Amino acid sequence: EIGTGFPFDPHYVEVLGERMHYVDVGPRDGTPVLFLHGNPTSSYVWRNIIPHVAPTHRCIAPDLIGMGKSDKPDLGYFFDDHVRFMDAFIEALGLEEVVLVIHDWGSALGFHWAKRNPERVKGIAFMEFIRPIPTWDEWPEFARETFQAFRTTDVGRKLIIDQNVFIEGTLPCGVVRPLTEVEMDHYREPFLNPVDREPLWRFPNELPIAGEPANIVALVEEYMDWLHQSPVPKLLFWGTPGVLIPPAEAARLAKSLPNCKAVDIGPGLNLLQEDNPDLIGSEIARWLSTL
Ligand SMILES: [Cl-]
Numbered sequence: 301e302i303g304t305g306f307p308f309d310p311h312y313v314e315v316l317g318e319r320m321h322y323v324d325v326g327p328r329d330g331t332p333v334l335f336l337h338g339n340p341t342s343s344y345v346w347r348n349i350i351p352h353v354a355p356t357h358r359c360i361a362p363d364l365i366g367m368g369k370s371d372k373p374d375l376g377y378f379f380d381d382h383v384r385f386m387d388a389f390i391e392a393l394g395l396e397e398v399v400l401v402i403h404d405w406g407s408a409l410g411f412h413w414a415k416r417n418p419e420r421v422k423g424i425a426f427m428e429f430i431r432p433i434p435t436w437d438e439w440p441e442f443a444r445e446t447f448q449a450f451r452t453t454d455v456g457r458k459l460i461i462d463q464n465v466f467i468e469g470t471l472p473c474g475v476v477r478p479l480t481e482v483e484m485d486h487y488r489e490p491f492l493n494p495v496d497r498e499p500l501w502r503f504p505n506e507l508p509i510a511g512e513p514a515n516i517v518a519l520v521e522e523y524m525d526w527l528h529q530s531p532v533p534k535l536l537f538w539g540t541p542g543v544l545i546p547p548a549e550a551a552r553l554a555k556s557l558p559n560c561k562a563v564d565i566g567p568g569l570n571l572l573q574e575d576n577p578d579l580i581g582s583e584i585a586r587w588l589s590t591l
Pocket residue numbers: 339503504505507
């Protein structure tokens with residue numbers, strides 16, 4: 301039974317005029333472990349991983365601005381807006397050195413932060429993360445047509461803003477096991493008002509695919525170059541068939557990235573946390589003990 305509950309007291313901090321919500325559990329001392337979720341999830345995606353880590357480490361898991369239980373201002377919710385809010389969140393909590401556990405757009409946030417603050421990062425655990433996607437040929441027909449549809453201000457907004465397709469359609473397609481309606485309700489909660497679904501649409505329009513948008517492709521190429529040269533301890537989780545990171549890509553990264561341990565979680569698509577939380581949390585705790 302994969303737990304469906306979210307038993308964490310809410311914490312809030314004011315960041316750039318907006319309230320950001322975060323989970324904060326574990327001992328107050330030591331190096332903190334910072335969990336960054338992506339699209340279209342929240343700290344909820346970490347709920348069954350954090351308990352493997354909280355016995356011996358501080359766990360901080362924020363909700364991105366406009367997502368989860370964080371405030372929802374009238375922004376475009378560009379990656380750049382998320383960079384500003386996450387930078388500020390980390391300083392507002394007074395974090396110095398951290399370990400990162402990051403996923404999907406959370407990973408783009410983490411890597412881009414790590415690149416800009418390499419002396420402050422003691423380890424990075426990552427999974428199903430954002431890397432440049434050279435061609436649409438890498439995706440199957442349905443995914444290709446859907447995400448190409450997403451990347452317009454007409455049909456894309458109709459699908460994601462009006463019809464809430466990213467939550468009701470895409471999200472369960474990123475999990476091998478069937479999500480329950482209780483879990484779905486936790487993922488749905490932040491976007492019950494359609495005007496609040498703006499981040500769900502801007503994120504796929506930011507994905508670095510076949511060279512566009514050029515600025516996001518450049519930013520991501522930068523932090524990937526950094527990641528290939530830094531000796532920071534790395535822990536890569538991957539599954540089969542995977543989505544952003546197919547088994548061949550995981551193998552490549554496992555050998556080419558310095559100081560990288562790779563863990564096969566078994567069956568998985570994008571939300572690896574929902575398919576093997578026990579192994580992911582267990583391995584993160586284990587890996588942490590070696591840092
Ligand atoms: Cl996305």
